[PDB]
Write a protein that binds this ligand. Structure first.
Ligand code: ZN
Length: 50
RNA sequence: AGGAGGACACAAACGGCGCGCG
DNA sequence: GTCCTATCGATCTTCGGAAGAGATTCAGAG
DNA sequence: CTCTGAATCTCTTCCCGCGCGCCGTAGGAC
């Protein structure tokens, strides 16, 4: 759930390299910001550091 | 006649309680 | 049945630790 | 009247692995 303790756009996406909203599923769109959910697509590991 | 035209990737978790062994 | 909110917001959470160390109070003490 | 004594307060601590095995949100409102 967004804006929660596990918000995707706050801490990071859950999928390996895919955004939560599913707009992008490739390294070709790595680093871009989606506007279907607001989550930033990057390496999911960053989710443990933000 | 002549002549003309014509989908890749991907293998199980975190805290108690109890027991037991070194 | 589902999904909810809230968590002794009318109790009594255990009495079979020891100690060791500070920290905090008190007590004649001038 | 506080000072510099004790005395009485709370807090911290307690070997290493290893296996079994269970056991693990709750009551209330639409
Ligand atoms: Zn997305």
């Amino acid at each position: 759930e967004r804006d929660g303790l596990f918000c995707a756009r706050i801490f990071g996406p859950v999928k390996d390299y895919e955004c939560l909203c599913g707009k992008y599923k490739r390294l070709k769109h790595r680093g871009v910001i989606c506007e279907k959910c607001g989550v930033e697509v990057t390496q999911t590991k960053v989710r443990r550091e933000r």
